[PDB]
Amino acid sequence: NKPIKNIVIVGGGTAGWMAASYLVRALQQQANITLIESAAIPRIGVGEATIPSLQKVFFDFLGIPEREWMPQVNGAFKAAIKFVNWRKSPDPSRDDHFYHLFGNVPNCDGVPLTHYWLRKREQGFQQPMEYACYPQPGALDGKLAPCLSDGTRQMSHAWHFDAHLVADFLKRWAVERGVNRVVDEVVDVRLNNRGYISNLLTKEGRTLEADLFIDCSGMRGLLINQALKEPFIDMSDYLLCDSAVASAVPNDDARDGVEPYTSSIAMNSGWTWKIPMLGRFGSGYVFSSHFTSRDQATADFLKLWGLSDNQPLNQIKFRVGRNKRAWVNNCVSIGLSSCFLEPLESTGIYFIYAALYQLVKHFPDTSFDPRLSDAFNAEIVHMFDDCRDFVQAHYFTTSRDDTPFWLANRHDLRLSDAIKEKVQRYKAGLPLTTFDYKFKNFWLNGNYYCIFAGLGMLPDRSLPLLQHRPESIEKAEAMFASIRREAERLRTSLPTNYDYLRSLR
Amino acid sequence: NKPIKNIVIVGGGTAGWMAASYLVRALQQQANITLIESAAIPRIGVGEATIPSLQKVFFDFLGIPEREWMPQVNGAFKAAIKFVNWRKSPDPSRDDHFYHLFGNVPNCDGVPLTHYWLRKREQGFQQPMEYACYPQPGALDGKLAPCLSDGTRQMSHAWHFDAHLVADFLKRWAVERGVNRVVDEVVDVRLNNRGYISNLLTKEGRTLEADLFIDCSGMRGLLINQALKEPFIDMSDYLLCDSAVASAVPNDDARDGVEPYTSSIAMNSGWTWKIPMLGRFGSGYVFSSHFTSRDQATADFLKLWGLSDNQPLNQIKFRVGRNKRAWVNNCVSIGLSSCFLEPLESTGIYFIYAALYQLVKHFPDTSFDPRLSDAFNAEIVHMFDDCRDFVQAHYFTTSRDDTPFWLANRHDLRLSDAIKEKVQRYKAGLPLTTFDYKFKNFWLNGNYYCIFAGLGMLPDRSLPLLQHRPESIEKAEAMFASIRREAERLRTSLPTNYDYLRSLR
């Protein structure tokens, strides 16, 4: 079986240039790669927060160290997601916030600290879960850096960056290593009798041929959905948000500092993201069209940040769900042309490089053994489903009942059996779980606990086992005190996030 | 909710004393534990090989180091399973053997050495997979120790031991730390209107009461099956063997040495185990009653080892399957009273301490929250199913067609969708996967490859990706050469298994 020789990527967004970079890297020899992107169809223009796997899975694989790509794309640090006004009836006189922190929660004699915390709360302990079980939240309040002045990491973290800059940075990297860039527009996809893609017809009359096609054409899915007619499974019965009004907002970094985390500010009919970096923060009101109008949501967004009726905006709508099959015949969909959940928790770009990782692990020859694509397609479903569960958990758990949108999340969502089971185990007092392993069950006990406890849904009781383990309870107190010590050191030890980034220019 | 106070274990076999030890360990305080065992109903008398998790999960948890319990139970080392006459038509003039080795196979640029080996075999490379991808098989042929004279580990391994001695060793350990032993026989189990166990009536007239009951009564399942009437799911449609004829056989260790591995010698209608230790080896012909008679199988067993018609034997039959629920109301089944697959691959005792681990992780209070047992019961099904897949893979993969029994394994077995999927991925050329994580997918790429390749079922082709990675192919050759070096060092470096064990008395 002859190997793949010519690859064509359709799309010049983040997805296409990640695909181009990764593939040019994975395929040392016998690989000609061409990417074509329409000068007249813009990128989506968002996608600026991430999760920890980005470096280990994507950039490391490219051989691009964190200190090299960060300053090139206005990179900033994301130590958490701060959730604001999610907990219940928004009250401007009450501080309703909680963090979803990255990183592992320690175990004490095989039991997560979360569960010793719950036991204490039962005895009247007032401190919130994440402030007792992690050392860094207080520092986040102080908008400090996730690492020392000298660059030594001090807490688990991901990244923020400029979406357009990232795409451009990879475009340069990829082109430099042999990727052929073509600024042009596909207008016809031709299929042989078998149903495979033979070539693309462009607006300037070019005919592009290839063995393998990567569809990174974004939500229109030029190859996978339209040409190959693979159905998209709409899942707006699982999740309500289908729109966003977004913009970049200037920040007075000198007076207000740079927050080392993404913020999720709950709204009337959705929520608003805040992704800070030097000079400004990306922002966007994610909402459901069925509970508010774009006009109405736009006014809410402008009001939230005190913006003016002249502020140019990025109006977006998106589909929620996944292709029935991500890879069909000789076409692999990657990016918005494949699956999407709303930007809560930031899984979009992870879907890109996780899919690319799976693609290489299932790489075909020109005979396109269906066993390979089927195995690939099944991994995508798992990856997507795991995240859909976690995202959904932010919603049907809410105690907010003040608008139709929150009522609908409370009562009207379709839930997978998988999330039902986890919730049932959680409520019973049981701990949840504590790359290939990461792609696998990426969201652990700690993550679900940050969310559930932040939202004010606690288990029915502490673990029955703990009543037999007074020693263990004692050791846990020691671990709590230790955490409290580290928290204090960091306060006087970490530079401000603002100052640290500036020291990176 | 009041905690559990009184626990009664029924059964004095390996299962009961593992339960008693583990529980007395896990439950520091507020735990009274009584074990009752009928002097007139003997233990099963087998169960003498194990897998690597035994130490980390069971003995370590007890605080009993390997050097302390081994000499107490005639412990020996198990570095592998050697399979003899499994490959095809048995021919006394052909050496048909292969090893299933414990331990991980190295990865080269994210691809297991197994797959680089396959690529070489395609070019005419003659050496067998396990001799190229692991350093220790040749040493096993030489019956060497898995560690240096001084006791430094040199290869991954599990253990062999005397079944009765192990049970007795734990009995002493457990009794010494507060377990109450009662030599007596349960004759009636009394249930309240709710259907929970109130107490046990013994033959001497004792009435035993408790909050929690552990059923370790072996295959009769005195509590779970008979009293509580939980159905046992027969799975002799998944696996054919239902009987064994066993005995201990003296060995001339001075002239023949001690093999550092379990042997699996395929027979006409089953297979025969060889579990060596100092002085003798446990052995047993596992067979299907539907393809040979006990009388016939007995004669085959005696002939295999040159035994005499006077040799006293352990005649066994066993059920294959699992309880519909391992834990029902206030009764947890552990051991042969719960699930069993035939002894191929040695999962029996693993089922014991893995279940005990899950029991403590789901430990109840006296209200017996059904969410706990349901979560427990589901983990048991996963554990069992994963092993049933792996065991089944030894059979429907066989190329032997010389008896009805092998024909039946070839064509007539009921296969899970899970094993079908793995096989399909394997055949396509894809790698398979590479405690809580162990219980999870304990059988990895290497294990399945040892088995499949030993049995002579290879993938349809090498990984398409490798054609683009000449560099990677090169590095793999280096790794192969390195493995060959270590193999040579061990040959001149390891003491004989026989000599090493003797140095332990």
Ligand SMILES: Cc1cc2nc3c(=O)[nH]c(=O)nc-3n(C[C@H](O)[C@H](O)[C@H](O)COP(=O)(O)OP(=O)(O)OC[C@H]3O[C@@H](n4cnc5c(N)ncnc54)[C@H](O)[C@@H]3O)c2cc1C
């Ligand atoms: C509101 C919103 C918020 C998000 N927030 C996050 C986040 O916080 N974190 C995160 O990781 N992800 C996020 N995502 C997802 C993320 O934005 C995308 O995964 C990422 O930006 C890559 O998108 P893309 O390249 O597939 O699509 P696009 O940006 O839409 O790129 C499409 C490309 O295909 C080209 N193209 C299309 N059609 C044709 C044609 N017929 N001929 C030629 N060329 C063509 C276009 O010109 C363009 O270059 C968010 C998405 C949305 C919608």
Ligand SMILES: Cc1cc2nc3c(=O)[nH]c(=O)nc-3n(C[C@H](O)[C@H](O)[C@H](O)COP(=O)(O)OP(=O)(O)OC[C@H]3O[C@@H](n4cnc5c(N)ncnc54)[C@H](O)[C@@H]3O)c2cc1C
């Ligand atoms: C042929 C064969 C080979 C095996 N090989 C292996 C192997 O290689 N590796 C491995 O790990 N496992 C193996 N196993 C499994 C292993 O033998 C068992 O898991 C282990 O020995 C524990 O068994 P048990 O204690 O549950 O049952 P048993 O040994 O049958 O113990 C039963 C106990 O319950 C008591 N009892 C019963 N009934 C009553 C009553 N009404 N009143 C009072 N008391 C009572 C009995 O007196 C006895 O003490 C094998 C099993 C078989 C059958």
Ligand SMILES: [Cl-]
């Ligand atoms: Cl996202």
Ligand SMILES: [Cl-]
């Ligand atoms: Cl077994």
